[PDB]
Amino acid sequence: GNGSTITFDELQGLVNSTVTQAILFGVRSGAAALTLIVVWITSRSRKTPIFIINQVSLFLIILHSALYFKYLLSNYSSVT
């Protein structure tokens, strides 16, 4: 993890291949968490495993915290 004098193409690749996936993954994952939450509230299905609750719990908070920082900065500036 040193400096890089390469063209912006590298960033265009990782932003359109590594980051592009992060957005999609976050969306499907957050949506899947939401639908499961309501299902447990109403359907009262068998108590989900600790790994499921811990996974979705972390993802929910981490999502909100990231959105909160991006929401406040979105007004300030997105270009240093």
PDB file of N, CA and C in Angstrom:
ATOM      1  N   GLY A   1       0.844  -1.213   0.000  1.00  0.00           N
ATOM      2  CA  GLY A   1       0.000   0.000   0.000  1.00  0.00           C
ATOM      3  C   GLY A   1       0.864   1.242   0.000  1.00  0.00           C
ATOM      4  N   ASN A   2       1.557   1.483  -1.117  1.00  0.00           N
ATOM      5  CA  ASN A   2       2.369   2.674  -1.361  1.00  0.00           C
ATOM      6  C   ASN A   2       1.673   3.602  -2.371  1.00  0.00           C
ATOM      7  N   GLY A   3       2.334   4.717  -2.705  1.00  0.00           N
ATOM      8  CA  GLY A   3       1.877   5.647  -3.732  1.00  0.00           C
ATOM      9  C   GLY A   3       1.749   4.999  -5.116  1.00  0.00           C
ATOM     10  N   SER A   4       0.985   5.663  -5.984  1.00  0.00           N
ATOM     11  CA  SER A   4       0.609   5.180  -7.310  1.00  0.00           C
ATOM     12  C   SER A   4       0.531   6.354  -8.294  1.00  0.00           C
ATOM     13  N   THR A   5       1.471   6.391  -9.244  1.00  0.00           N
ATOM     14  CA  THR A   5       1.559   7.403 -10.313  1.00  0.00           C
ATOM     15  C   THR A   5       0.824   6.985 -11.597  1.00  0.00           C
ATOM     16  N   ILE A   6      -0.030   5.958 -11.509  1.00  0.00           N
ATOM     17  CA  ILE A   6      -0.798   5.433 -12.638  1.00  0.00           C
ATOM     18  C   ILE A   6      -1.947   6.394 -12.981  1.00  0.00           C
ATOM     19  N   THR A   7      -2.446   6.315 -14.215  1.00  0.00           N
ATOM     20  CA  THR A   7      -3.624   7.040 -14.692  1.00  0.00           C
ATOM     21  C   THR A   7      -4.865   6.781 -13.834  1.00  0.00           C
ATOM     22  N   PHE A   8      -5.833   7.703 -13.918  1.00  0.00           N
ATOM     23  CA  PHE A   8      -7.109   7.618 -13.201  1.00  0.00           C
ATOM     24  C   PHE A   8      -7.920   6.357 -13.543  1.00  0.00           C
ATOM     25  N   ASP A   9      -7.586   5.676 -14.648  1.00  0.00           N
ATOM     26  CA  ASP A   9      -8.161   4.411 -15.108  1.00  0.00           C
ATOM     27  C   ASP A   9      -8.254   3.361 -13.989  1.00  0.00           C
ATOM     28  N   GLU A  10      -7.237   3.274 -13.120  1.00  0.00           N
ATOM     29  CA  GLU A  10      -7.231   2.346 -11.981  1.00  0.00           C
ATOM     30  C   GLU A  10      -8.401   2.624 -11.037  1.00  0.00           C
ATOM     31  N   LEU A  11      -8.558   3.904 -10.667  1.00  0.00           N
ATOM     32  CA  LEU A  11      -9.676   4.389  -9.873  1.00  0.00           C
ATOM     33  C   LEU A  11     -10.988   4.149 -10.614  1.00  0.00           C
ATOM     34  N   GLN A  12     -11.063   4.438 -11.920  1.00  0.00           N
ATOM     35  CA  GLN A  12     -12.260   4.148 -12.718  1.00  0.00           C
ATOM     36  C   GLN A  12     -12.625   2.656 -12.710  1.00  0.00           C
ATOM     37  N   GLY A  13     -11.639   1.753 -12.695  1.00  0.00           N
ATOM     38  CA  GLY A  13     -11.864   0.318 -12.576  1.00  0.00           C
ATOM     39  C   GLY A  13     -12.363  -0.065 -11.186  1.00  0.00           C
ATOM     40  N   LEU A  14     -11.602   0.230 -10.125  1.00  0.00           N
ATOM     41  CA  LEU A  14     -12.034  -0.114  -8.764  1.00  0.00           C
ATOM     42  C   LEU A  14     -13.354   0.580  -8.372  1.00  0.00           C
ATOM     43  N   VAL A  15     -13.618   1.809  -8.834  1.00  0.00           N
ATOM     44  CA  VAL A  15     -14.869   2.519  -8.528  1.00  0.00           C
ATOM     45  C   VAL A  15     -16.066   1.951  -9.318  1.00  0.00           C
ATOM     46  N   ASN A  16     -15.824   1.374 -10.503  1.00  0.00           N
ATOM     47  CA  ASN A  16     -16.862   0.810 -11.366  1.00  0.00           C
ATOM     48  C   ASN A  16     -16.924  -0.728 -11.312  1.00  0.00           C
ATOM     49  N   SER A  17     -16.127  -1.369 -10.445  1.00  0.00           N
ATOM     50  CA  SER A  17     -16.068  -2.832 -10.280  1.00  0.00           C
ATOM     51  C   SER A  17     -16.032  -3.260  -8.809  1.00  0.00           C
ATOM     52  N   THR A  18     -15.196  -2.627  -7.977  1.00  0.00           N
ATOM     53  CA  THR A  18     -15.094  -2.915  -6.535  1.00  0.00           C
ATOM     54  C   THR A  18     -16.156  -2.134  -5.750  1.00  0.00           C
ATOM     55  N   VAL A  19     -16.252  -0.815  -5.971  1.00  0.00           N
ATOM     56  CA  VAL A  19     -17.266   0.051  -5.350  1.00  0.00           C
ATOM     57  C   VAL A  19     -18.660  -0.229  -5.896  1.00  0.00           C
ATOM     58  N   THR A  20     -18.842  -0.379  -7.219  1.00  0.00           N
ATOM     59  CA  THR A  20     -20.164  -0.672  -7.808  1.00  0.00           C
ATOM     60  C   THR A  20     -20.862  -1.817  -7.062  1.00  0.00           C
ATOM     61  N   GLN A  21     -20.101  -2.862  -6.700  1.00  0.00           N
ATOM     62  CA  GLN A  21     -20.600  -4.007  -5.955  1.00  0.00           C
ATOM     63  C   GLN A  21     -21.034  -3.637  -4.533  1.00  0.00           C
ATOM     64  N   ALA A  22     -20.293  -2.754  -3.852  1.00  0.00           N
ATOM     65  CA  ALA A  22     -20.577  -2.288  -2.496  1.00  0.00           C
ATOM     66  C   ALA A  22     -21.973  -1.652  -2.391  1.00  0.00           C
ATOM     67  N   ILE A  23     -22.329  -0.786  -3.355  1.00  0.00           N
ATOM     68  CA  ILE A  23     -23.660  -0.166  -3.439  1.00  0.00           C
ATOM     69  C   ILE A  23     -24.729  -1.255  -3.569  1.00  0.00           C
ATOM     70  N   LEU A  24     -24.612  -2.113  -4.595  1.00  0.00           N
ATOM     71  CA  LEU A  24     -25.579  -3.177  -4.888  1.00  0.00           C
ATOM     72  C   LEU A  24     -25.762  -4.095  -3.674  1.00  0.00           C
ATOM     73  N   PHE A  25     -24.646  -4.573  -3.098  1.00  0.00           N
ATOM     74  CA  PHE A  25     -24.608  -5.434  -1.921  1.00  0.00           C
ATOM     75  C   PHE A  25     -25.324  -4.784  -0.736  1.00  0.00           C
ATOM     76  N   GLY A  26     -24.973  -3.533  -0.409  1.00  0.00           N
ATOM     77  CA  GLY A  26     -25.639  -2.748   0.626  1.00  0.00           C
ATOM     78  C   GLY A  26     -27.155  -2.664   0.440  1.00  0.00           C
ATOM     79  N   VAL A  27     -27.610  -2.392  -0.791  1.00  0.00           N
ATOM     80  CA  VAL A  27     -29.035  -2.287  -1.141  1.00  0.00           C
ATOM     81  C   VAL A  27     -29.762  -3.604  -0.865  1.00  0.00           C
ATOM     82  N   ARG A  28     -29.389  -4.686  -1.571  1.00  0.00           N
ATOM     83  CA  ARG A  28     -30.030  -6.004  -1.413  1.00  0.00           C
ATOM     84  C   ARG A  28     -29.991  -6.482   0.044  1.00  0.00           C
ATOM     85  N   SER A  29     -28.858  -6.273   0.725  1.00  0.00           N
ATOM     86  CA  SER A  29     -28.650  -6.679   2.112  1.00  0.00           C
ATOM     87  C   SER A  29     -29.557  -5.906   3.075  1.00  0.00           C
ATOM     88  N   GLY A  30     -29.581  -4.569   2.984  1.00  0.00           N
ATOM     89  CA  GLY A  30     -30.450  -3.729   3.812  1.00  0.00           C
ATOM     90  C   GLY A  30     -31.933  -4.035   3.591  1.00  0.00           C
ATOM     91  N   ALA A  31     -32.347  -4.196   2.328  1.00  0.00           N
ATOM     92  CA  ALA A  31     -33.706  -4.604   1.979  1.00  0.00           C
ATOM     93  C   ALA A  31     -34.072  -5.974   2.577  1.00  0.00           C
ATOM     94  N   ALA A  32     -33.205  -6.987   2.408  1.00  0.00           N
ATOM     95  CA  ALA A  32     -33.381  -8.316   2.995  1.00  0.00           C
ATOM     96  C   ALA A  32     -33.501  -8.265   4.530  1.00  0.00           C
ATOM     97  N   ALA A  33     -32.678  -7.450   5.202  1.00  0.00           N
ATOM     98  CA  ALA A  33     -32.817  -7.193   6.634  1.00  0.00           C
ATOM     99  C   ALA A  33     -34.202  -6.616   6.981  1.00  0.00           C
ATOM    100  N   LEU A  34     -34.642  -5.546   6.306  1.00  0.00           N
ATOM    101  CA  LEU A  34     -35.954  -4.929   6.542  1.00  0.00           C
ATOM    102  C   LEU A  34     -37.113  -5.927   6.436  1.00  0.00           C
ATOM    103  N   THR A  35     -37.205  -6.673   5.326  1.00  0.00           N
ATOM    104  CA  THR A  35     -38.275  -7.667   5.143  1.00  0.00           C
ATOM    105  C   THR A  35     -38.244  -8.734   6.243  1.00  0.00           C
ATOM    106  N   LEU A  36     -37.063  -9.211   6.662  1.00  0.00           N
ATOM    107  CA  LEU A  36     -36.968 -10.194   7.748  1.00  0.00           C
ATOM    108  C   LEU A  36     -37.460  -9.608   9.091  1.00  0.00           C
ATOM    109  N   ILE A  37     -37.143  -8.335   9.377  1.00  0.00           N
ATOM    110  CA  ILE A  37     -37.514  -7.657  10.626  1.00  0.00           C
ATOM    111  C   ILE A  37     -39.035  -7.675  10.768  1.00  0.00           C
ATOM    112  N   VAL A  38     -39.747  -7.113   9.781  1.00  0.00           N
ATOM    113  CA  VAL A  38     -41.215  -7.099   9.790  1.00  0.00           C
ATOM    114  C   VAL A  38     -41.779  -8.517   9.904  1.00  0.00           C
ATOM    115  N   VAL A  39     -41.251  -9.494   9.150  1.00  0.00           N
ATOM    116  CA  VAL A  39     -41.681 -10.902   9.223  1.00  0.00           C
ATOM    117  C   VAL A  39     -41.615 -11.414  10.661  1.00  0.00           C
ATOM    118  N   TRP A  40     -40.499 -11.220  11.372  1.00  0.00           N
ATOM    119  CA  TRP A  40     -40.407 -11.622  12.778  1.00  0.00           C
ATOM    120  C   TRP A  40     -41.435 -10.902  13.672  1.00  0.00           C
ATOM    121  N   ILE A  41     -41.718  -9.619  13.418  1.00  0.00           N
ATOM    122  CA  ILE A  41     -42.712  -8.830  14.166  1.00  0.00           C
ATOM    123  C   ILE A  41     -44.141  -9.393  14.005  1.00  0.00           C
ATOM    124  N   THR A  42     -44.534  -9.806  12.793  1.00  0.00           N
ATOM    125  CA  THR A  42     -45.902 -10.278  12.476  1.00  0.00           C
ATOM    126  C   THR A  42     -45.991 -11.799  12.369  1.00  0.00           C
ATOM    127  N   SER A  43     -45.298 -12.400  11.394  1.00  0.00           N
ATOM    128  CA  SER A  43     -45.288 -13.842  11.127  1.00  0.00           C
ATOM    129  C   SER A  43     -44.835 -14.653  12.336  1.00  0.00           C
ATOM    130  N   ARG A  44     -44.056 -14.030  13.238  1.00  0.00           N
ATOM    131  CA  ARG A  44     -43.575 -14.611  14.496  1.00  0.00           C
ATOM    132  C   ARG A  44     -42.897 -15.973  14.293  1.00  0.00           C
ATOM    133  N   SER A  45     -42.267 -16.136  13.122  1.00  0.00           N
ATOM    134  CA  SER A  45     -41.538 -17.330  12.713  1.00  0.00           C
ATOM    135  C   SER A  45     -40.472 -17.706  13.738  1.00  0.00           C
ATOM    136  N   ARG A  46     -39.982 -18.948  13.664  1.00  0.00           N
ATOM    137  CA  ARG A  46     -38.963 -19.467  14.580  1.00  0.00           C
ATOM    138  C   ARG A  46     -37.830 -18.460  14.771  1.00  0.00           C
ATOM    139  N   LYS A  47     -37.498 -18.198  16.042  1.00  0.00           N
ATOM    140  CA  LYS A  47     -36.411 -17.312  16.462  1.00  0.00           C
ATOM    141  C   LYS A  47     -35.171 -17.562  15.603  1.00  0.00           C
ATOM    142  N   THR A  48     -34.794 -16.538  14.845  1.00  0.00           N
ATOM    143  CA  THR A  48     -33.651 -16.572  13.940  1.00  0.00           C
ATOM    144  C   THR A  48     -32.355 -16.811  14.726  1.00  0.00           C
ATOM    145  N   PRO A  49     -31.321 -17.382  14.085  1.00  0.00           N
ATOM    146  CA  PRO A  49     -30.064 -17.671  14.760  1.00  0.00           C
ATOM    147  C   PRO A  49     -29.348 -16.376  15.160  1.00  0.00           C
ATOM    148  N   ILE A  50     -28.547 -16.452  16.231  1.00  0.00           N
ATOM    149  CA  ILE A  50     -27.736 -15.337  16.735  1.00  0.00           C
ATOM    150  C   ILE A  50     -26.884 -14.691  15.640  1.00  0.00           C
ATOM    151  N   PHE A  51     -26.319 -15.503  14.739  1.00  0.00           N
ATOM    152  CA  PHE A  51     -25.509 -15.047  13.617  1.00  0.00           C
ATOM    153  C   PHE A  51     -26.313 -14.150  12.670  1.00  0.00           C
ATOM    154  N   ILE A  52     -27.578 -14.499  12.392  1.00  0.00           N
ATOM    155  CA  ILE A  52     -28.492 -13.700  11.568  1.00  0.00           C
ATOM    156  C   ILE A  52     -28.755 -12.364  12.256  1.00  0.00           C
ATOM    157  N   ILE A  53     -29.195 -12.391  13.525  1.00  0.00           N
ATOM    158  CA  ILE A  53     -29.519 -11.172  14.271  1.00  0.00           C
ATOM    159  C   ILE A  53     -28.287 -10.272  14.380  1.00  0.00           C
ATOM    160  N   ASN A  54     -27.131 -10.818  14.763  1.00  0.00           N
ATOM    161  CA  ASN A  54     -25.883 -10.068  14.845  1.00  0.00           C
ATOM    162  C   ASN A  54     -25.468  -9.468  13.490  1.00  0.00           C
ATOM    163  N   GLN A  55     -25.523 -10.261  12.407  1.00  0.00           N
ATOM    164  CA  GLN A  55     -25.229  -9.814  11.044  1.00  0.00           C
ATOM    165  C   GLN A  55     -26.103  -8.615  10.670  1.00  0.00           C
ATOM    166  N   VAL A  56     -27.431  -8.786  10.715  1.00  0.00           N
ATOM    167  CA  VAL A  56     -28.374  -7.731  10.324  1.00  0.00           C
ATOM    168  C   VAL A  56     -28.251  -6.525  11.252  1.00  0.00           C
ATOM    169  N   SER A  57     -28.122  -6.725  12.574  1.00  0.00           N
ATOM    170  CA  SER A  57     -27.913  -5.653  13.552  1.00  0.00           C
ATOM    171  C   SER A  57     -26.714  -4.787  13.177  1.00  0.00           C
ATOM    172  N   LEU A  58     -25.519  -5.380  13.039  1.00  0.00           N
ATOM    173  CA  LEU A  58     -24.338  -4.632  12.606  1.00  0.00           C
ATOM    174  C   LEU A  58     -24.604  -3.897  11.295  1.00  0.00           C
ATOM    175  N   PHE A  59     -25.094  -4.609  10.274  1.00  0.00           N
ATOM    176  CA  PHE A  59     -25.367  -4.027   8.962  1.00  0.00           C
ATOM    177  C   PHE A  59     -26.302  -2.811   9.039  1.00  0.00           C
ATOM    178  N   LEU A  60     -27.386  -2.899   9.824  1.00  0.00           N
ATOM    179  CA  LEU A  60     -28.346  -1.820  10.079  1.00  0.00           C
ATOM    180  C   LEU A  60     -27.669  -0.566  10.653  1.00  0.00           C
ATOM    181  N   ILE A  61     -26.931  -0.709  11.765  1.00  0.00           N
ATOM    182  CA  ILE A  61     -26.220   0.419  12.381  1.00  0.00           C
ATOM    183  C   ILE A  61     -25.172   0.979  11.418  1.00  0.00           C
ATOM    184  N   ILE A  62     -24.285   0.129  10.882  1.00  0.00           N
ATOM    185  CA  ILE A  62     -23.205   0.532   9.972  1.00  0.00           C
ATOM    186  C   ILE A  62     -23.767   1.306   8.771  1.00  0.00           C
ATOM    187  N   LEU A  63     -24.873   0.821   8.184  1.00  0.00           N
ATOM    188  CA  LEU A  63     -25.638   1.519   7.152  1.00  0.00           C
ATOM    189  C   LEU A  63     -26.049   2.912   7.628  1.00  0.00           C
ATOM    190  N   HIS A  64     -26.811   3.009   8.728  1.00  0.00           N
ATOM    191  CA  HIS A  64     -27.277   4.296   9.241  1.00  0.00           C
ATOM    192  C   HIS A  64     -26.108   5.251   9.494  1.00  0.00           C
ATOM    193  N   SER A  65     -25.052   4.817  10.188  1.00  0.00           N
ATOM    194  CA  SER A  65     -23.879   5.645  10.494  1.00  0.00           C
ATOM    195  C   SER A  65     -23.199   6.184   9.226  1.00  0.00           C
ATOM    196  N   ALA A  66     -22.950   5.315   8.235  1.00  0.00           N
ATOM    197  CA  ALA A  66     -22.403   5.712   6.937  1.00  0.00           C
ATOM    198  C   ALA A  66     -23.319   6.704   6.201  1.00  0.00           C
ATOM    199  N   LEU A  67     -24.628   6.413   6.124  1.00  0.00           N
ATOM    200  CA  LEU A  67     -25.620   7.331   5.560  1.00  0.00           C
ATOM    201  C   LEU A  67     -25.627   8.669   6.321  1.00  0.00           C
ATOM    202  N   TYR A  68     -25.484   8.664   7.648  1.00  0.00           N
ATOM    203  CA  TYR A  68     -25.524   9.875   8.458  1.00  0.00           C
ATOM    204  C   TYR A  68     -24.351  10.794   8.109  1.00  0.00           C
ATOM    205  N   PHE A  69     -23.127  10.253   8.105  1.00  0.00           N
ATOM    206  CA  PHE A  69     -21.948  11.005   7.683  1.00  0.00           C
ATOM    207  C   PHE A  69     -22.095  11.528   6.246  1.00  0.00           C
ATOM    208  N   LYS A  70     -22.486  10.665   5.293  1.00  0.00           N
ATOM    209  CA  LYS A  70     -22.669  11.082   3.895  1.00  0.00           C
ATOM    210  C   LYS A  70     -23.773  12.128   3.732  1.00  0.00           C
ATOM    211  N   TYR A  71     -24.845  12.055   4.524  1.00  0.00           N
ATOM    212  CA  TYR A  71     -25.963  12.995   4.506  1.00  0.00           C
ATOM    213  C   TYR A  71     -25.538  14.385   4.991  1.00  0.00           C
ATOM    214  N   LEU A  72     -24.774  14.459   6.086  1.00  0.00           N
ATOM    215  CA  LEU A  72     -24.234  15.729   6.570  1.00  0.00           C
ATOM    216  C   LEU A  72     -23.186  16.305   5.601  1.00  0.00           C
ATOM    217  N   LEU A  73     -22.245  15.482   5.110  1.00  0.00           N
ATOM    218  CA  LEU A  73     -21.215  15.947   4.171  1.00  0.00           C
ATOM    219  C   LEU A  73     -21.792  16.324   2.791  1.00  0.00           C
ATOM    220  N   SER A  74     -22.887  15.675   2.358  1.00  0.00           N
ATOM    221  CA  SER A  74     -23.569  15.901   1.074  1.00  0.00           C
ATOM    222  C   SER A  74     -23.900  17.378   0.838  1.00  0.00           C
ATOM    223  N   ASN A  75     -24.212  18.119   1.909  1.00  0.00           N
ATOM    224  CA  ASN A  75     -24.438  19.557   1.843  1.00  0.00           C
ATOM    225  C   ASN A  75     -23.133  20.372   1.850  1.00  0.00           C
ATOM    226  N   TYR A  76     -22.148  19.987   2.677  1.00  0.00           N
ATOM    227  CA  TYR A  76     -20.855  20.668   2.798  1.00  0.00           C
ATOM    228  C   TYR A  76     -20.089  20.715   1.469  1.00  0.00           C
ATOM    229  N   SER A  77     -19.621  19.557   0.987  1.00  0.00           N
ATOM    230  CA  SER A  77     -18.835  19.398  -0.243  1.00  0.00           C
ATOM    231  C   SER A  77     -18.408  17.940  -0.412  1.00  0.00           C
ATOM    232  N   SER A  78     -18.425  17.459  -1.660  1.00  0.00           N
ATOM    233  CA  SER A  78     -17.972  16.116  -2.040  1.00  0.00           C
ATOM    234  C   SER A  78     -16.680  16.136  -2.874  1.00  0.00           C
ATOM    235  N   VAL A  79     -15.957  17.267  -2.873  1.00  0.00           N
ATOM    236  CA  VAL A  79     -14.731  17.515  -3.640  1.00  0.00           C
ATOM    237  C   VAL A  79     -13.724  18.320  -2.802  1.00  0.00           C
ATOM    238  N   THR A  80     -12.664  17.660  -2.324  1.00  0.00           N
ATOM    239  CA  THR A  80     -11.565  18.303  -1.584  1.00  0.00           C
ATOM    240  C   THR A  80     -10.590  19.003  -2.536  1.00  0.00           C
TER     241      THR A  80
END
